[PDB]
Every structure is written in structure tokens, then in C-alpha cells.
Design a protein around this ligand. Sequence first.
Ligand SMILES: *[C@@H]1C[C@@H](O)[C@@H](O)[C@@H](CO)O1
Ligand SMILES: *[C@@H]1C[C@@H](O)[C@@H](O)[C@@H](CO)O1
Ligand SMILES: [Mg+2]
Ligand SMILES: [Mg+2]
Ligand SMILES: [Mg+2]
Ligand SMILES: [Mg+2]
Ligand SMILES: [Mg+2]
Ligand SMILES: [Mg+2]
Ligand SMILES: [Mg+2]
Ligand SMILES: [Mg+2]
Ligand code: NA
Ligand code: NA
Ligand code: NA
Ligand code: NA
Ligand code: NA
Ligand code: NA
Lengths: 193, 204, 1011
Amino acid sequence: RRDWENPGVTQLNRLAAHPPFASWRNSEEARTDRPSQQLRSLNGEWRFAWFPAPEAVPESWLECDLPEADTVVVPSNWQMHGYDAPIYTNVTYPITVNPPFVPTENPTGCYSLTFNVDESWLQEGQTRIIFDGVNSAFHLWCNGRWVGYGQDSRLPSEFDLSAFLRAGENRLAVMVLRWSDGSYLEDQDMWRM
Amino acid sequence: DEANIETHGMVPMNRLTDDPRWLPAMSERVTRMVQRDRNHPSVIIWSLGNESGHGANHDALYRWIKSVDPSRPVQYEGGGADTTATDIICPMYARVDEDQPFPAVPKWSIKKWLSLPGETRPLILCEYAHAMGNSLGGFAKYWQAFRQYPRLQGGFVWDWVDQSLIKYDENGNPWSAYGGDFGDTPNDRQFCMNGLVFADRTPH
Amino acid sequence: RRDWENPGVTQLNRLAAHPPFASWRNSEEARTDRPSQQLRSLNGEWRFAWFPAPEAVPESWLECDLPEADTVVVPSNWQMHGYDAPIYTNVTYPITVNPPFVPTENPTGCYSLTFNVDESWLQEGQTRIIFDGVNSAFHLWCNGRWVGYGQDSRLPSEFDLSAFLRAGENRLAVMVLRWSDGSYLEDQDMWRMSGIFRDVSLLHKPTTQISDFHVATRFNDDFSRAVLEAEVQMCGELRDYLRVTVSLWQGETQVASGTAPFGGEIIDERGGYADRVTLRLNVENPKLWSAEIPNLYRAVVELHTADGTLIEAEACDVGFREVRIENGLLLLNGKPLLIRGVNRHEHHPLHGQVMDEQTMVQDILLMKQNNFNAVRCSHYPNHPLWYTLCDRYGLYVVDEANIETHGMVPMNRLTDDPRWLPAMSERVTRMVQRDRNHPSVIIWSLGNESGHGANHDALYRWIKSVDPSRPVQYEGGGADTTATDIICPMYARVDEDQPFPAVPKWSIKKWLSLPGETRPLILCEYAHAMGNSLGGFAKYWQAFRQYPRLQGGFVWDWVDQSLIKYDENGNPWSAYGGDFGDTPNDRQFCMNGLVFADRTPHPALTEAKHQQQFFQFRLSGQTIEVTSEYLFRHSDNELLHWMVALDGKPLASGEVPLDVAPQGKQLIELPELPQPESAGQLWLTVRVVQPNATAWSEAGHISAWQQWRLAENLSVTLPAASHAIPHLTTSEMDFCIELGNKRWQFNRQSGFLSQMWIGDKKQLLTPLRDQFTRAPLDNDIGVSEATRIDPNAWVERWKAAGHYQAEAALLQCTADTLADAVLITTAHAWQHQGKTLFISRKTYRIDGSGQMAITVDVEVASDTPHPARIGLNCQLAQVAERVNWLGLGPQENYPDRLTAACFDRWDLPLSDMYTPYVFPSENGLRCGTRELNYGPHQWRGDFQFNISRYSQQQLMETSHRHLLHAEEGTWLNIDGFHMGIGGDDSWSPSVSAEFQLSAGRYHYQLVWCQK
Ligand SMILES: *[C@@H]1C[C@@H](O)[C@@H](O)[C@@H](CO)O1
Ligand SMILES: *[C@@H]1C[C@@H](O)[C@@H](O)[C@@H](CO)O1
Ligand SMILES: [Mg+2]
Ligand SMILES: [Mg+2]
Ligand SMILES: [Mg+2]
Ligand SMILES: [Mg+2]
Ligand SMILES: [Mg+2]
Ligand SMILES: [Mg+2]
Ligand SMILES: [Mg+2]
Ligand SMILES: [Mg+2]
Ligand code: NA
Ligand code: NA
Ligand code: NA
Ligand code: NA
Ligand code: NA
Ligand code: NA
């Protein structure tokens, strides 16, 4: 579907936006703004591989780690790790102007993470993942099954992972597109990463 | 707090923002921001984005905000800095005394702008005093005007920190790079360095 | 992907919306609006198969025809072909409310068409397909390959098939989903149907083409000069040799023409639109457009090269007119409008929601003939031809986005939600893009009954911003929200407030003046015309004329949404909600029109015609003052006819030509009125006749009328000494009276006249008894259900009080002989649960002349609900061919709905005295009657009456007119007083106090004699 070349599709299966949540289960903690056991961070070491276009991504990657991937820190901008060049252009778009299309050679960052989920989170309630910032668009899969898609590099994209996880280890796979129809709305005078 | 919408490179600049087919995407960038940030007292004004001309999508979005959150004014500089999509005259680089009468989107002297026939809004520059390199000459002239005129309520200097990036030489020594230093082209060279402080926060 | 359960996907691969195109390749054809060889209709015979869900559709279907499929006509609604039942539900959604999901069992219509395509369409240019209407969502494939998807059942969806077609035979496959997330925005109170119900066409455009064009007309202060501004956009490769010429024609005369290369003015720091250009043409003394005189020009837009070669041409009709709101008034060409409007659904009793030109024309003519000047597209953009016809015939139109979410709780649950902003925006933006060049469209509406949410505020500003030429209105959320330029309530009463919390409906007169309010008020819906209704219609009209800011309204509604069903013998009958097995359903509530489904008028239409007249009259002595309510035209096709009659007998008449300027007055002096020779009341009637035929009426058309009583000479002439004296025969059980060959029998235990004979012929089948009830009207019923009684409705109050069950108890029955007559005296009480509801005292005086004088005095307990009527009734033994009376008519009229009727001598076949409302009820009354004739009987007095082959009992026990059966004889109901019918709304008591029978004591008198 090339959702990334359609301003009519800015997301798929994304949850409604809302003020910062932490789902405290102790009120005094909520009063003092202390860490909540219900809001966990997935930042740290992830697996990442770079491809020149989405078409080059192997299907194996959805179900299994690519051996060639490297381990890198997240959050990060892939240009900062040297996988491709960051570009500094002020007004002129860094891509040919032909909305809503983007180049066929479109740098694609394949990120994945194997992580644990305690059964307690799965026995009751809802487990959602929150990506505070992904530039510029992306598809998400969990344990090989597709969950959803998102655009707008500067707002959080949230998805309900409740029906996709299992107790113990789980693996996320995030295919991130450098260019998308959202890029047409992201022409700020700054480095393009 | 400003929506992630800038389509500066379009010709004319409002080509997308005046196109209803782009209303949905723009809409999500403005509504999702308000939904997330509306309980922060530090946010006092909402902005519809930057340099995307003035299109009807702006007017619809301006109204949506006015509707959902009457507590904070809405501003937007595109299309001339004083359109119907802004509660505040918010030009970028309008000079203190000198007019720059560009066609369609003139940049009037700020003192003169306030009193144009029928005008009554406050004026706060969204960008002024471009701090690129050895600059900030004439800074005091703005301040003197802001203090003498009630409706000149100040501005946002352009900008805080140079967007320089660190590169390493043959010897492994770090150096400050700018546009084109990564083999990027086309590029706008040093134009990305306009701050009051260097990228490491040392003041200029 | 289940794109039909995601409000974020309203289409895929669909092309931009734009005004009506035809891609002519000859300018004169464009000028004349002739058929274009580049616009083909694909309407006709298609293949179709129905499936219970999209999952059951065979993949084979994409590649080739399903054998099981049938051949059917397109456009159509598949329910009208019998594939599934149409459903009639008003507010409650027809599917479970669980947005954005729809039922798994989702009726799916698989249509396909094999057709040819000429290589000349493919060798160059673009070939697109256009679906003017698909209900409610669909996927499209061409030659087996997937093309795109579309939602919004009321606007065209277009797709480029250029790369998918091949010269020769081709096959389209369209899978239509009955339900989709779009349905949540389509909860209009009408039949729920589905299918490809509006036109399907192929349009060929050149690669370098006109992709959009907007036309504006601005004027000077007195409208004596105008500027026509035409903005034109193109697609394709720009080249310096390209040009656009826009020329303006008034008939065959070229009024103006301008040519320019592409390249608009600078808009911002990045420049201007290199792919657009604006042409401005000056027009001196333009002929202005209005509903009164729909003057039109033709605009032709040619895209060509500098050397003069035409690439293509597009065109439109142009109406020079300005609409603006100023100082609280809606002005058209600077004059304040008075909207005589009606809401009109696209409904055909045989074809469902498929519209055709003949039906449209028929509606427009009847509308105009009935003094309407405006229509509200309730509640979605209409088939495109509709606008062309309004522009040319002349009607003011309110164009409304297809958005209604009435079934949500609360009403604005979706419209206040930003996730639904995108879907809603397309419903508004695409309508504007399509219809903005039509002069008949004067106001945009954001939809209907969707509460008031922030999405409405955003879309209200979008409109104001792209098209300042027309005001924006919207009723939701209280009728006077920030999303409306006009206060446009539904069913707000004239004088009576209905202070509901949050969304009160104030008296319109008071609403205007609430603190801080300054806008004009035009009801988006009023005078609910369900069944026997329109009671109090004059009250609205009187207020609209008295209050400048009360600028009219749209009656609800034009046509009953009944559908045709066939019985065992194959005969047709009119069906409503539930009649197709649909449930839940809202039964008859889909029938609220001024006309029946087949366009035959209901009696209410004539009341509408009269109150909406364009000429007002006053009489002073021999002087008649005629005032014109036209804003623009002189009465150049009108003559005033007048006639003076004495009790029905013509005394004199004449005619005078009308020559009144818009808003002017004309005095006409009548000639000396020669005294008359007999007692009686002289009545003056005037009528305005249009001698010449017009585009909407025939020569002789009567457009207005009025009557006045003139002198009356009361009869003081003492009868004449009867030739004989009636004889009284008393027996244990009866008082009989004999006179000549006539006999009357009064039963002593019942206290009623049980039989009357002419010679040996009995004249009654049922005795003559008082009657205090009526077969309930729709307005009497309200929402009351046997399964869910509304205790506040009139019918429920009457039931509960025992009105329909009360039995007559005799209190007295005596007989006396007078010098020349026999006098019978009776008294009866009607009781229920031990309470006396009514007491009826009467005298029957039978004299030597054979006349029977009946005097009736009734008492009605103060604490019982006011009764439906106070009269007598009986079943006559005979059936006669005609009914002749001296009273108000000729059509059915009631206390609160009799202004249009005239006092005169009328004579109609008996069946005309019965009004076949689909849902039967009390009907066919005539009021203000001084003499009634039927067979050899005559009744004289000052009463109201109805006469037919159906008892009230039957009418009240029957739900559909097709099941009524003529009883033996003729049922006659003669009322001293009858309650009004109401209709301000039909779900709450709406009869005004002044029309309720609350006086407590009532008197009436009648004379029954032979003729
Ligand atoms: C105002 C907008 C900002 O993003 C920069 O482009 C600045 C000039 O450096 O102008
Ligand atoms: C106003 C809205 C319309 O669709 C109908 O529901 C009418 C009542 O029959 O009220
Ligand atoms: Mg997209
Ligand atoms: Mg703990
Ligand atoms: Mg495991
Ligand atoms: Mg910029
Ligand atoms: Mg350069
Ligand atoms: Mg959808
Ligand atoms: Mg409704
Ligand atoms: Mg009258
Ligand atoms: Na100041
Ligand atoms: Na810069
Ligand atoms: Na008025
Ligand atoms: Na209805
Ligand atoms: Na005349
Ligand atoms: Na009935």
C-alpha cells in the first residue's frame, strides 16, 4: 500500500492522543511525581540495520534478528551513528518536489528489540507501546505480526500491544522510513535526519 | 507550543496548506499537539506551525483551537504575519523603523505596523535579531521600541544554539561542521548556525 | 485492510473534486450545453450478485462474470430489486453503535459491467470513471486489477482508469458495502438502502486540461455594474503558448471576453500559482438572478494555444446575484428575503433513492405552483442535475453536507472528536468544490442533527474562508451556536417557548431578541406535515411578515417517503416502516410530506400555497388594496379577478389588470354594489390569475386569493303556516312522530333517534348519537406506542380518561305536543369509572313543514382532557354520488387549517370527501358549513362535517389505507365544534390553546329536513 506516499493515511491502528500518563497504582506516588512501576522504559540497546529502500528489507527480519545487524543505542538518529549522511538544506526540499511521492531510494532503518513482559501485565489490563518520536514514518510489528503505522516525527505514536504479547520474551520490529508524505510538512531549516 | 507543519519549499508557499486534501494530515499535527500539551501552565500560546504560507487549512485549524481551548491565544506568521489565522501580529525580521514593502507579504516597521488602519492586535516578533556569526547589531533599538510602545510586546530571537555537528579529523580531533560537510548536496552551508551560543553551549 | 472500518481512510486513489465537467472540444457546444462526445453514460444494464458479507465474495468474480449473477438496471438501490429489505429507522442507528466497526454480516452488492472503449480515448488523454453516487462504500477493479476505494454516498467519486483500460472490451467490478464507517455519518431519518444509485459515466480529458474553475460576481452599490471574476487552474505541462479565454454570453450575444496566459499574482514569499490564472470581465447593467426572475448568462472557459487551437472547453450557467447578511437581515441583491421553503429528500416510491429528471421537474413545478421559492437539500448534496434545474427554473437552495450522527449519545460524540475531523471535512469540502458555481445555492449547511462539536466550528471557518459569497448555517447544538450565521431552529413555535435544557427551542419571536442576539432567523424545519397536519401554519406566516428578522423557513417536508408493495392480486399499496420485515423501525414517521409519494397533493399543500402568496390584500369600502411582496419583478403576468356572491349565488364580478411594482401597492375601486334581493351574507372573493403560461405554470394559473364578508341582510321573514301538523304516537318503548309520508322514531330507553323513514324506506343503519372522539391523527398519537405509551400525547389522555369507552346513560326522554309541532327532550350523561365526563341535553322540534330542528347543549367536566370534538354521528342507509354544501372548501379543512378554504357552494363526488392518508385517521372535515346536501337529505346550521364510507371506529382500527373497506351506507359526522389538528411538531401536543375545546359548556343547533 505504500502508506508513506499518501497524505490520506497518516496512521493505522494508532491510539488517541492524551496528556502524559503513568497509571500509578499508588496515589501518593502520583502526588509526588515519583517513578511508576506501570510506565517502563524501553530505551537502551537495540538491534539495527540500514537498507537503501523498504523493498530491500528481508522478510526474515520480521521473525528473526538479522545477523548482520549491529547493536546501537536508542533513542538515536541513524546519521549520528554514521549509517548515512545528515543533510542541511534550508528552504529547498531535500527530495524532489512531487507530492505526495518520495524517492524510490528511501533510507530505511530496521530496528528491533527483544524484551521481557511479566505475566502480571498480561493477565489483566492493557499494555501499550509509546514511541515519543520516530522520524519520519514507520511500520511496527510485534512477535512477527503487524500492529500499525505512524507519521508526524514530533508527537508520540501509541499502539495497544495487549493481544500481541506473551509472557517472557517478545520481539518488536520497527521499519523506519527516512522520507514520507509527512516530509512534505517537515521542511524546517535544520539538519534532515 | 507549535505544530510540526512547515512546507517552506513549496511554490507558492501555501500550495499544500490551501489544499483541502492536505487538511487531514495538517489537522492531526495541530489537534494531537493540543491534546497532549494543554494541561501545561508554561504553554501560553499555540502556534499553527511555521513558513507554510497562509491557506484555508490554517483558518480551519485556528478555529478548531479557539474552540477547544479558549484559554490561550493562537498565533501564526505565514502569509504576511497579520492574517485572519493569528491573534498576534508575529512577523519575522520586521525592522524597528525601516519598512520592507515586499509585495503581498510586506514586512512593515514594527512601530508602523501596529497603527495601520483598522489594526488593533499586539505585536510580538516570532523571529528577530538573526544571531548568525558576528551579529546582534541594532539589538538595543528593538528593546528601546518594545519599552516605549505598549503593544510592542517583544519577540523571540532567532535563535538559541548553533546547529553545528561534530566531525573528527584524520588525527581524531573533533571539529565543528556545517552544511555540505557530510557530502550533503545541495546544502545551505553555514546558514544552520544562527545561535547566541555555540553547539556546546559556550556563549557567543 | 478492512478500509470500511476506519474513518481515517475515506478513499484510495480518488481524484480531486471539481465542478461539473464535460470536456467539450468545440466551444459552441459548450456554450449551448449540448451533449459532449467526451462524456459517456455507463447507465443501463449491469450484472449484479448479492452476498451476505464481503468475505463471501468469490475471487473468481474479479476476473469474470458470476453465472449466478443477474442482469439489472443501474442506477438502482438493490433493495428495490428485492435483494434485501430496506430499513426505516429515524434516530436509532440501523447497526450496533460501536464506531468505527460495522456488523460482520454486511450485505455486499457485486456489480460488474462489460463494455467497450475506443482506442481514440486511450491513445491520448485521460479516461476517468465517475460514480455520482455509491451507498455506502466501495472497492473498484478494472480488468481484474484493483483501482481504488471511496466513501460518502452523496458525492461523486472519480478514478483515473487510463492505465487500466484497453481498446475494445473491458470489465469493471464494483463491490459495494452496505455498511461502513461512513454510515456513522449517514444517520438521516429516511429509508436505509444501498447500491450504485446515481449515474456512472466515463469522462475523457486531454492531458493538458482545465482541472478546476471558480466563478464570482461582485457588484457596485446599486447593482448597476458587476465584475465577473473567473479563477482557472490547469493540470499538465505548462507552456508559454498556453492560454485561457473566458467569455460571457447572454443568449446569443457575447457580452464580454478576456484572454490570458497562465501565471497568477504573487501570493507569498515563494511567489504565486504558475498553473492558474484569473480573468476579470466588466459587465454593465447585468440582468440579475433571483427566484423571481432567474436571469442567466453562460460562462465558457476555453483552454487553447496562442495560435488559436482549442484544447478543451468547460462551462457553466452564471446567475449575477449577491447574498449577504447585513444588520441582521439576509439580503439577496440588497433586498431582504422571505423564504417560502420546503425540505425535499430524493425519494421515488418505485425507484427508492434513484432520481430522474422527470421527477425533479415535476417537483419543481408543483413547488413553484404552490408558492415555494426555496428548497433545503435535506440532508446531503443532491444529484447534480437538481442544481441545474434550480438555477434555471429559479429556486433558492440550501446545499447541505452529508453528515448526520443523530443516533450518537450525546449527539456530538463524533463531531466533537478530532479523529472524525478528516472524514467530516471531506463531506463539506468536496460539496463546496462541486457546487460553488451554482447561483441557486445561496447558503451552505454543515449537515444535520449532529450536535455541535469543534469539528463544525473548524468547517464553518473553512467555508467562510474559501467562499465568502454565501452564508453558512447549521442547526445542531441549539440552533444559534458559533457555527451558524443564521438562527435556524427546527420546530421552534411562534409564541410558545419549549425550554429544554441545553438546547431550548424558544418562541421565534423571543429568540430574535435574546440579549446580545442579532442574527436573522429562518427555521431549517417547521410545520411538520405528517398526515392530517399543518394546523397553525398561518400563525408562522403572520409572524414572518410582521418581524423583519423572521425571514421564513423550510417546511418538513415535501414528499411522503412511502414505498410501493404489491398484494396477493398484484395490486400496489403504500408501505412504511416495518412493512419489509425491517426492525427495529419507526413505522409511519417517514411519511411527513405535503404530497403523497406519487406527487398527488395532500390537502395541506393548499394551505401552504395560500399563506405563501406573494400578494397581500386589504379592503376598505369599495376599495381593495393589493400589495406586492415580490422584491424584483413587477406584476407583469397578473390580473385581479373579483366576484361577489350571496350565499353562493353570484351577483357580480369583473377583472382588472394588476400593475404593481415590487413592494408597491395598487388601489382598485369596485363598482357600486347593487343591492341584493334576498336575505343572506354577501361574500367578496378575489383571485390573482396569470394570463400567460410561463416556464413553471399554465395560462390561467391562480397564484393568490382572499375573501371578505360584505353586507349581510338577516332574515326576519316569518316562515308560513304549515299545511299540516305532525302527530305523536306514544308507546312503552318509543315516541314516534308522523308527518305526511315521513316518520321519526325515538327509542325511550336509549333516548336517541333510532330510525327515520321516507315512505317505507329506512334512512338510518345506526342511531343518531353524540360523538366526543375522533380516530386519532398522527399528531394526536405522537410517539405513543402500545408497547411504550406516551402518557402526555392527546390520544393517551383521551384513552385514559375513558373518552373512547364512555357510555351514554339516559337521564331523561320526554315528548310534548305543541300547537304545530312535536317536541322531544332528552338528556344523557357519559361516564367512565363513575365520573361524568359529558352531559348532552337536546330538543328535537318536528313541525308541519317536516323540518326537524335539533338543539344541543353540552357540558364537559373541567377536569377531563378537552375532547376531540362535540358533535353527532350516524350511519345513513343510503349511498349517494355527490356531496353539495355551502361552507368552506372545496378541500378538507380544520379549525387551525382553514385559511386557504373559501366560503361558497361546492359540489364533489363522495370519494373526494375522504382524504386517503396512508396512515388512516379522522379526515375530510369541512368547517364553516351552513348547509349540507346528500341524497334527499339537507342539514342546515353552522357546523363542521365529514361524510364517507368509513366509520371513525374503522379508521382508528386500521393502520394502512389499503386495508380499509367501505361500510354499508354512509357515515356522517356533524360537529358543532372540532378540535384543531396542530402539527408544530408531531411528537408532543401541538394544538394551540385557542383551538382546544375548553369552554366547558357548548351549544349548537341544526335543522335536518328532506330535499
Ligand atoms: C525564521 C525561520 C527559522 O526556521 C530560520 O529559517 C530563520 C532564518 O535562519 O528564519
Ligand atoms: C428534522 C430532521 C428530519 O430529517 C426529520 O427527522 C424531521 C422529523 O420528521 O425533523
Ligand atoms: Mg501517509
Ligand atoms: Mg513499588
Ligand atoms: Mg517465550
Ligand atoms: Mg523555513
Ligand atoms: Mg549551495
Ligand atoms: Mg473507512
Ligand atoms: Mg435525524
Ligand atoms: Mg382569509
Ligand atoms: Na511594549
Ligand atoms: Na537558519
Ligand atoms: Na420577516
Ligand atoms: Na420523519
Ligand atoms: Na399585470
Ligand atoms: Na388509524
